[PDB]
């Protein structure tokens, strides 16, 4: 399968979906932390939010990273498959 | 609202578990899983 390019790209798609899903969850959690519809700052703390924002951003980058790498791997497998058939004209 | 935040965190962890399934399906990459874990755990912690 790390030999099947159509599959890697598919896998990339999945991780992209995961990335979208996390971004949307992070955005809903942001709103909830802020806690709004007069509501004063009895809501979620400033330092915890920063931890969260950071954790979310890490997760999204890692997810983007796996996507990117799979896409690059597919591209790399095709480039070499193609180069191989040429050498054997 | 503290209820919403707990429900969201529960949903976040389902998503984390969903991700682990895909990672496994995409067979020294045990660090990806560990780091992934850490960050979700941090989010989960701060929301209980």
Numbering used by the authors:
A (entry chain B): 5 to 41, 46 to 97
B (entry chain A): 13 to 39, 49 to 69
From the paper:
Of particular interest are the Esx complexes which are dimers of two subunits (ESAT-6, early secreted antigen of 6 kDa; and CFP-10, culture filtrate protein of 10 kDa) and which are secreted across the cytoplasmic membrane by Type VII secretion (T7S) systems. The overall architecture of the complexes is similar to known Esx structures in that each heterodimer forms a four helix bundle with the CFP-10 and ESAT-6 subunit homologs each contributing an α-helical hairpin to the complex.
Using this expression approach we expressed and purified six Esx complexes and determined the crystal structures of M. abscessus EsxEF (EsxEFma), encoded by the MAB_3112 and MAB_3113 genes, M. smegmatis EsxGH (EsxGHms), encoded by the MSMEG_0620 and MSMEG_0621 genes, and M. tuberculosis EsxOP (EsxOPmt), encoded by the Rv2346c and Rv2347c genes, at resolutions of 1.96 Å, 2.70 Å, and 2.55 Å, respectively. The structures of these complexes were determined by single wavelength anomalous diffraction (EsxEFma and EsxGHms) and multiple wavelength anomalous diffraction (EsxOPmt) at resolutions of 3.0 Å, 2.70 Å, and 2.55 Å, respectively. The asymmetric units for the EsxEFma crystal forms have a single complex in the asymmetric unit for the SeMet-labeled protein and six complexes in the asymmetric unit of the native protein crystal form while the EsxGHms and EsxOPmt (both crystal forms) contain two heterodimeric complexes. The WXG-containing loops are well ordered in the EsxGHms complexes and in most of the EsxEFma complexes but the majority of the connecting loops are disordered in the EsxOPmt subunit structures. The average amount of buried surface area in the subunit interfaces varies considerably [EsxEFma, ∼1605 Å2; EsxGHms, ∼1555 Å2; EsxOPmt (form I), ∼1025 Å2; and EsxOPmt (form II), ∼1175 Å2] and the percentage of the surface of each subunit buried in the complex interface is also highly variable, from 13.5–33%, and is related to the degree to which the termini of the subunits are ordered and to the conformations that they adopt.
